[PDB]
Design a protein around this ligand. Structure first.
Ligand SMILES: Cc1c(C(=O)Nc2cccc(C(F)F)c2)c(C)n(C)c1C(=O)C(=O)N[C@H]1CC[C@@H](O)CC1
Ligand SMILES: Cc1c(C(=O)Nc2cccc(C(F)F)c2)c(C)n(C)c1C(=O)C(=O)N[C@H]1CC[C@@H](O)CC1
Lengths: 137, 131
């Protein structure tokens, strides 16, 4: 193998993304819907636009395929569909979110937030402010 | 439901890739070993390098993850339908990086025409990829 890190070029890492808990991210369903609402046009465009765009186009598509395979598994063949939406799902949720968020609010920001929440959420309930960190520009 | 074309930002289409036959493409096996032997460093690197680099990184991992699914299922379709889609994209990109984008598209059409000429008429020499 190689050791290719998607995020590395963008200035994150696969670990750092695993710093936010699995339940921090939207659904895939909702991630797709947003990109569409905000960036469908840039995304379908034949213009590079940004490295976020390239990557997101490819992810959106890869997920399409992945789903066809789980559907086709339903048609033709509990087990797998519990696994896809679980492990693979998280991995897409992460990448989708990183990149939509990077574009919506700014990348530098999305990283400042990435740590802030990781730390905050981990402060146990007793001591930690009820006020969570906030994402904006 | 969006209609996104991966190749479109690079000035091709899914259509055009389907122009070359299913067995024009290397193996997935050989495609990964080639990217490695030529661009392990460029790809693992944290520099964008080019939009090609970006897409390949993603393509590879997507394949990686997909295969990890088969390392769990075993407990025939994949390589059939999906395999082609990877082959087309991987080949496209490596082949752009190696020889040139415009140079690969010229070949894409040169070959598609050539292969489709019937045996009796068609010159014995398939066209050539290089710079
Ligand atoms: C919005 C948001 C998100 C978030 O990630 N939302 C989100 C949901 C689905 C998909 C995606 C996609 F980008 F990946 C993002 C997170 C984690 N926080 C802490 C926030 C907010 O700070 C917040 O509620 N801000 C308001 C409202 C918005 C206003 O523009 C600024 C003020
Ligand atoms: C190389 C090649 C390929 C091809 O696609 N090769 C290939 C195989 C596995 C992986 C990849 C990768 F880019 F994804 C590419 C095709 C279709 N043709 C017609 C050729 C050649 O023109 C050829 O053999 N040229 C020689 C040797 C090379 C010299 O630089 C010029 C002269």
């Amino acid at each position: 193998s190689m050791d290719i890190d998607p995020y590395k070029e963008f200035g994150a890492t696969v670990e750092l993304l695993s710093f936010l808990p699995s339940d921090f991210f939207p659904s895939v369903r909702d991630l797709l819907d947003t990109a569409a609402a905000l960036y469908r046009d840039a995304l379908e465009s034949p213009e590079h636009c940004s490295p976020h765009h390239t990557a997101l186009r490819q992810a959106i598509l890869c997920w399409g395929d992945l789903m066809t395979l789980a559907t086709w598994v339903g048609t033709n063949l509990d087990l797998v569909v519990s696994y896809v939406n679980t492990n693979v799902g998280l991995k897409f949720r992460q990448l989708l979110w990183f990149h939509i968020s990077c574009l919506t609010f700014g990348r530098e920001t999305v990283l400042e937030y990435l740590v802030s929440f990781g730390v905050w959420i981990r402060t146990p309930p007793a001591a930690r402010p009820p006020n969570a960190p906030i994402l904006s520009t």
